[PDB]
Amino acid sequence: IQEQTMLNVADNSGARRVMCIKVLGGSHRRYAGVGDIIKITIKEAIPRGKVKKGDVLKAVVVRTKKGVRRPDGSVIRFDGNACVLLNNNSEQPIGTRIFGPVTRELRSEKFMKIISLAPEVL
């Protein structure tokens, strides 16, 4: 995942697709991986209620195409890319429910509230 990339949304906030812009604390030539919080600007969504289409917010990458290897030696790959929108309230999703599975290292050590709302875990 790099800047100007189009990924899908995982929460029911009204947004459909998202376009990456920048990554927080990542001075590298094009990049944004699973677990990294990035500044974004949704493209397709509901242009009313609360100006969705056009606004810039933050999000957390959950699924990507690139394959990641695990301690056992097996690599896993997904179809496309997805992310979850978060508000000002320190690492808190703006949506109600989440869609799609999540990683393990993203539970215990880092987020404990995201796992509680996660339906699947690989």
Partner: protein, 209 residues
């Protein structure tokens, strides 16, 4: 006999009741004829041969001792016909692996890891690699930056780069001795051992097991 030495044959494995299945590196440990033993001293930190013990020389074995008591003695190698040995010289120099080697015993095996010419920063001193799209930019094994501040257009000697190698000594500790068997008097070491096949590797009672 601070330890013995053999030639790496290859890597196999032996499933033992106790413990669990684990790869084993076969090492040829055979007849040697140590005529003398060269002892080195640690002057500051520069190896230097104190003396050499022949078939009969109490004038050299004495200095060898004491210096050891002073803990100033360095690694010990002795003029050998095939492979090394220590207290083996005093006897006659003629000995077999059966005399020194038991199984299930822990030993420290050191050796020079395996000419490859010039290599890329990565394949070289383990440098990582361009993860992320960095790899997509087909810039796989490249630091991407020879050095900061284009001016000087110089690369800090530090700023590790590419170069020559092959043609590094490593002493892996805690290497359990599975067993001594094969067509010839060999040794079965648990796991892997530094260096390629045919390379000379030494054995030594595990300093700490």
């Amino acid at each position: 006999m601070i330890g013995l030495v053999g030639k790496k044959v290859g890597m196999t494995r032996i499933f033992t009741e106790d413990g669990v299945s684990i790869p084993v590196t076969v090492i040829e440990v055979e007849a040697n004829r140590v005529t003398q033993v060269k002892d080195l001293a640690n002057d500051g930190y520069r190896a230097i041969q104190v003396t050499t013990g022949a078939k009969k020389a109490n004038r050299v074995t004495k200095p060898e001792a004491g210096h050891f008591a002073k803990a100033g003695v360095e690694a010990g190698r002795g003029l050998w016909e095939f492979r090394l040995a220590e207290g083996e010289e005093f006897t006659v120099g003629q000995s077999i692996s059966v005399e020194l080697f038991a199984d299930v015993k822990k030993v420290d095996v050191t050796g020079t890891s395996k000419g490859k010419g010039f290599a890329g920063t990565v394949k070289r001193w383990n440098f990582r690699t361009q993860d992320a799209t960095h790899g997509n930019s087909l810039s796989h094994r490249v630091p991407g930056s020879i050095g900061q501040n284009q001016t000087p257009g110089k690369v800090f000697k530090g700023k590790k780069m590419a170069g020559q190698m092959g043609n590094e000594r490593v002493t892996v500790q805690s290497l359990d001795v599975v067993r001594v068997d094969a067509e010839r008097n060999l040794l079965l070491v648990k796991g892997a051992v530094p260096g390629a096949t045919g390379s000379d590797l030494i054995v030594k009672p595990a300093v700490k097991a």
